[PDB]
Symmetry: D2
Subunit: 298 residues, 4 copies
């Protein structure tokens, strides 16, 4: 199974003038590697892919891949609505040295099932890399159902996992039973911090969740305890992860919150975000701070 | 805090001719008491309240209350769309000796917030019993938001808990923070089996969930392990409860499934259900059987 | 085609204690007949079926049928969640002299398609009357799709029409093409005032809409003009119907608004509504009055 | 009031390699102008903006503006998720000679109301052109409510209209009453063919709808008849517009259907569409042909 364990959706650090902040993004990457994560995912939702132009995404991917320098597996988010662009970004990712790509369903038009399957098959045909699907129905307005995902896995042998981003135990359960029941090495990662523990107990593989950026140790330690058979210890970490998603209510998009949390938890990066996100206000920064303090994360 | 712990939504047993089956309902009640449940809830969703007429509901409630004979706390579900009937059923419950009532929001019209608050205040004023709210937005089409529930708890001191029936960690978390933060003894019970563990870890109080009927021991033992501080053991039980809700996909309504599971797990009752539910077919009964066998529950 | 044209969902008039107000209900009935409606529908949504007990519904139906005394066709709404009660209320309606029944899908559980089909077939088989389906997905949470309605019409020859209560030209169009295409004499009536004209232009049959109660002449004259081939005149009436539904925003449920409008338009009936509806406040009554005045309806 | 009347969302014609087909696009533009439309809108949903790259969008806009050569007002769709790009594309439009821009809400993240308002203010402040809002909640997952639109119009005097793309009479009515009530010259255009007649009768201003591409004469003649006071004639054209949208069910996205209809109605342009749209199959092309024949459009 590929891309299992804890794989953060890394925040992209920008300067106050809105350019890629290489020193800060590099420092964040190095913090996460040092924390023991199993991989890194750039240009996810929290990486601001949807607020970046294609050339910007290419430049950020190349930078990140080269900085990681093969220390851990690297995933690049290459999706969008422009399918020709998805292919271009995906081929660019493979040429630049990525280990895999992560592809959401098109999220403007909710295309027909025939078109959706074709789209994923075309993207998967365009690269030799492993492809992770990305389900985020709250934002896309179109669910990647366990049945559909199984059909995709049956069709292309490089479609090998999913980031299932949904506050639903039923969806994670059914994804695992349906897809992993046919393809035991297909990877199921939850996209929310508070579903990691359940995902493992259900027979899934890990998480790609925003708290990976500012508190990776919580998820890394949970996974380690689980793998060591220390369930009580894993449940302890889980109690923390259950509470963390309160912070994401502070703003929408909450990409600002995540970067403010990176700062609060001890890595001083520019927290600039791209429009239509905006800077978190001071009152809400203090609220975030009190949450992190109550959970003992700063 | 009232009505905490494991409180099954007890199935109502009917004969093949569609009458209350007293010996079978009584035997089920006695099994659940013997299993160590903290209470019993009659005429919930799984108790078929919505397929019963008012006079039938009164007769069932009286019978159940009388059979239980104060061995454990008894809740009666008294809700519907007809608010005058809600009041009648609730006063009847109090006269018959119930310990509390459980009241869903009206689920045909999704009434204005002013009307909704007024409805609950009137119902709560009609009895001196404790009132548990019932949130089931997938069926009602109107969520009881944590803010609203807090407003209700602030308004009437007998509105003392909620059965929050939703596959959402965020909803449970927020219900607990918002309502229990203002009213530390307000009771938050989850309505789905696979959220019991998380509900406890989040600072909530228990569950009213269908598996209480046929595998009460799993929830009772989880709660006991949690109260004893043996979190690993509680997590073990949780791994089971994570899987159980697959069975509910076998039919809709799944009241048939629950009764078939009672039979398969060792209590031979008539499994008749009221229309528009219908008998579970033999293939799906076998499927249910294989599910219960895999989880070691029969 | 049965039950075509303008058929108001007649308001049920109550005294302050919530009992049937026979003189007021009768006067309303006579006003509508005198206005030239094609039929009358009692115990629809606007008739407060869902806030009335089964015995109450039977008394109201008997009264209404008897008062109408065969002057126009009479439809009784017999639906709910309790399917045994549906059958009882439907057989009661037939015995009491109703010309047809109107049956909504169960709206607590959204039952499986197999259960839903079986429900409607059983209800249709319980009577020898014509049966009109009732679609109100905003309230029921489960759409009766054109495909499903076609399947029902294909299955039972007494399932002969629908009240399609949705603000959707596409839904009405597709209902008409899919069902009337297979069953040219199946009756399609929209449930909203502002869709009557389009319904007629699409090949449908009329409307069961709330403004039937207080401004029947608008819909009756629209229909007459359309049948006489005076499309410009019909469009003139449509311009009024397009505006009327603003008033329904004044409260939820808006059964109060409709009765207040009956009073304002010249018929002094009690405006009492059953809980959890409540009286319309004086400021909103004055707003309703201004709107009616601007549309030249009082 | 600006940009009133019939303004087609013009299809973008491509060669097989997915590049702009200048002769075919120009011919289409000339056909529409000759048909008497009041304006032209490029790079709307039907113009495939969300499957085009930013440089491609700029090239298309420039070409279209230039070909139109001020014969009618020109709108350019400049929206997306990347707000910096929205500003670039909007300023580019103004520099290229557009008369106005059309901006949808960001449709990946459904951003907070504060962020949404700020977004629209920033885009409006980036140009001195008139700005038309674009509401398409079926695709965006976030409705621009009449209250929000009013707040935007109150805030910026160059936010001067909306393409309200929704199958809802209530939404159009309320948009008109709430926004035009406060801003009588704010332009309200429906985005669907079957809502033009109602939109005019409600006090709105026209339509930007896909049938503008292949049957502009229907909407142009409807509008002329309405302005001339010949309501019966207008209603006759409406009967045709009521039926046209059945064709859009032939695929999703239906940008293919629209181009095939342009061909079938007598203008031979390439029907190539960008992925993830795909070619319409021959059976569905024949079905489309039969429909157009039945409505007397080819
Ligand atoms: O992946 C989704 C994130 O926002 C939550 O961790
Ligand atoms: O009683 C609630 C049902 O959803 C079963 O858990
Ligand atoms: O019939 C539907 C009601 O909501 C009023 O038209
Ligand atoms: O504007 C939206 C179009 O597809 C409908 O005409
Ligand atoms: Mg993220
Ligand atoms: Mg239940
Ligand atoms: Mg009504
Ligand atoms: Mg279009």
């Amino acid at each position: 199974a590929l891309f299992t364990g804890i794989i953060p959706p890394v925040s992209t650090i920008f300067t106050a003038d809105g350019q890629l902040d290489k020193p800060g993004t590099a420092a964040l990457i190095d913090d996460l590697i040092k924390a023991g994560v199993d991989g890194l995912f750039f240009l996810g939702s929290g990486g601001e892919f949807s607020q970046l132009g294609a050339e910007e995404r290419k430049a950020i991917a190349r930078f990140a891949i080269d900085h990681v320098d093969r220390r851990v597996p690297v995933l690049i988010g290459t999706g969008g609505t422009n399918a020709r662009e998805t292919i271009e970004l995906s081929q660019h990712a493979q040429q630049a040295g990525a280990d895999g790509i992560v592809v959401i369903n098109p999220y403007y038009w909710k295309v027909s099932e025939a078109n959706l399957i074709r789209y994923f098959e075309q993207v998967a045909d365009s690269v030799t890399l492993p492809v992770m699907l990305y389900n985020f129905p709250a934002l896309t307005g179109q669910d990647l159902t366990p049945a559909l995902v199984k059909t995709l896995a049956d069709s292309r042998s490089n479609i090998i996992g999913i980031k299932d981003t949904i506050d639903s135990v039923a969806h994670l359960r059914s994804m695992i039973h349906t897809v992993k029941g046919a393809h035991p090495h297909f990877t199921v990662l939850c996209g929310y911090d508070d579903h990691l523990f359940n995902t493992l107990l259900l027979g899934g593989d890990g998480a790609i969740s925003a708290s990976g950026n500012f508190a990776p140790q919580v998820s890394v330690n949970l996974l380690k305890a689980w793998r060591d058979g220390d369930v009580a210890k894993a449940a302890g970490y889980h109690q923390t992860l259950l509470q963390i998603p309160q912070m994401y209510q502070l703003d929408t998009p909450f990409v600002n919150v995540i970067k403010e949390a990176i700062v609060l938890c001890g890595r001083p990066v520019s927290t600039h975000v791209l429009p239509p996100a905006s800077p978190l206000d001071e009152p809400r920064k203090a609220q975030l701070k009190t949450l992190l303090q109550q959970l003992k994360l700063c």
